[PDB]
Design an enzyme around this catalytic site. Structure first.
Site, PDB file in Angstrom:
ATOM      1  N   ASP A  90       0.770  -1.247   0.000  1.00 15.13           N
ATOM      2  CA  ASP A  90       0.000   0.000   0.000  1.00 15.13           C
ATOM      3  C   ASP A  90       0.796   1.290   0.000  1.00 15.13           C
ATOM      4  O   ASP A  90       0.322   2.306  -0.496  1.00 15.13           O
ATOM      5  CB  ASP A  90      -0.962   0.006   1.214  1.00 15.13           C
ATOM      6  CG  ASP A  90      -1.814  -1.269   1.309  1.00 15.13           C
ATOM      7  OD1 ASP A  90      -2.241  -1.856   0.273  1.00 15.13           O
ATOM      8  OD2 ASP A  90      -2.068  -1.729   2.437  1.00 15.13           O
ATOM      9  N   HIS A 139       6.640  10.090  10.403  1.00 14.29           N
ATOM     10  CA  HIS A 139       6.221  11.453  10.034  1.00 14.29           C
ATOM     11  C   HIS A 139       5.874  11.545   8.537  1.00 14.29           C
ATOM     12  O   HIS A 139       4.831  12.074   8.175  1.00 14.29           O
ATOM     13  CB  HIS A 139       7.355  12.430  10.402  1.00 14.29           C
ATOM     14  CG  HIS A 139       7.058  13.876  10.147  1.00 14.29           C
ATOM     15  ND1 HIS A 139       6.955  14.832  11.136  1.00 14.29           N
ATOM     16  CD2 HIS A 139       6.917  14.554   8.973  1.00 14.29           C
ATOM     17  CE1 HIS A 139       6.767  16.018  10.539  1.00 14.29           C
ATOM     18  NE2 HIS A 139       6.738  15.878   9.221  1.00 14.29           N
ATOM     19  N   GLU A 140       6.730  11.017   7.670  1.00 10.08           N
ATOM     20  CA  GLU A 140       6.459  11.080   6.240  1.00 10.08           C
ATOM     21  C   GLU A 140       5.285  10.197   5.853  1.00 10.08           C
ATOM     22  O   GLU A 140       4.528  10.551   4.967  1.00 10.08           O
ATOM     23  CB  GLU A 140       7.686  10.689   5.424  1.00 10.08           C
ATOM     24  CG  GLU A 140       8.925  11.497   5.719  1.00 10.08           C
ATOM     25  CD  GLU A 140       8.707  13.011   5.648  1.00 10.08           C
ATOM     26  OE1 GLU A 140       7.758  13.447   4.967  1.00 10.08           O
ATOM     27  OE2 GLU A 140       9.498  13.760   6.294  1.00 10.08           O
ATOM     28  N   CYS A 194      -7.281   0.619  -0.417  1.00 11.57           N
ATOM     29  CA  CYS A 194      -6.180  -0.326  -0.229  1.00 11.57           C
ATOM     30  C   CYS A 194      -5.813  -0.666   1.217  1.00 11.57           C
ATOM     31  O   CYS A 194      -5.168  -1.688   1.474  1.00 11.57           O
ATOM     32  CB  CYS A 194      -4.931   0.070  -1.032  1.00 11.57           C
ATOM     33  SG  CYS A 194      -3.988   1.463  -0.369  1.00 11.57           S
TER      34      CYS A 194
HETATM   35 CA   LIG Z   1      -3.476  -3.313   1.421  1.00 13.12          CA
HETATM   36 ZN   LIG Z   2       6.365  17.202   7.796  1.00  8.20          ZN
END
Ligand SMILES: [Ca+2]
Ligand SMILES: [Zn+2]
Length: 197
Positions: A90, A139-140, A194
């Site tokens: 995903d 974080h990302e 997903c």
């Molecule tokens: Ca999935």
């Molecule tokens: Zn950030």
């Protein structure tokens, strides 16, 4: 209410040179980060599943540039062209030893869960303290789930949390209440299919 996120971590060649080609050392490093983020995300009702870990031992499959923006775009495009036909997942994150120009240690597309070329992020292996790098990874990934930076009274039993606009060792490895709200609101409204399975 519970959601499941299948993820693939991609380690680049600069990373491999940094660990002197030691594949097992690199796996231990990434595994500990996943263990940390799995806990952080469980509190948001999202289960993290490590689908795969790809290490670019021979050579990089994309051009990793000093420009974080060009690198993210290249990675997202390689994901859609190659990786997705190899491993069902995903979201994918690139771990690199490159020092991005400017004050950039990580970058991701916003609110892009399930998108072939956009459900991705880029993070610099910026510290020797595993916890700090694992925090940037979380974080990302959160940016992919539509969450923005913490501000004002947002808290996680203290104010400096995962979505803080700056990283310091005073940052706690948990999301703030604001992050919970934004994340669950995105799931609610966009309902990325997903992460249902
Ligand atoms: Ca999935
Ligand atoms: Zn950030």
């Amino acid at each position: 209410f519970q959601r499941y996120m299948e993820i693939v971590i991609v380690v680049d060649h600069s990373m491999v040179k940094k660990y002197n080609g030691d594949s097992d050392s690199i796996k231990a490093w990434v595994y500990e980060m996943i263990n940390t983020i799995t806990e952080s995300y469980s509190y948001l009702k999202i289960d993290i599943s490590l689908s795969g870990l790809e290490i670019w031992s021979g050579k990089d499959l994309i051009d990793v540039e000093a420009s974080a923006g060009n690198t993210l775009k290249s990675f997202g495009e390689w994901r859609a062209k190659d990786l997705i036909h190899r491993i069902s997942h995903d979201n994918a994150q690139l771990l690199t030893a490159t020092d991005f120009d400017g004050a950039t240690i990580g970058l991701a597309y916003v609110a892009s869960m399930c998108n072939p070329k956009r459900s991705v992020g880029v993070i610099q292996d910026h510290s020797s303290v595993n916890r700090l790098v694992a925090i940037t990874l979380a974080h990302e990934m959160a940016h992919n789930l539509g969450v923005s930076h913490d501000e004002g009274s947002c808290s996680c039993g203290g104010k400096s949390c995962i979505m803080s606009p700056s990283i310091s060792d005073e940052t706690i490895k948990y999301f703030s209440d604001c992050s919970y709200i934004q994340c669950r609101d995105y799931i609610s409204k966009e309902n990325p299919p997903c992460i249902l399975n």
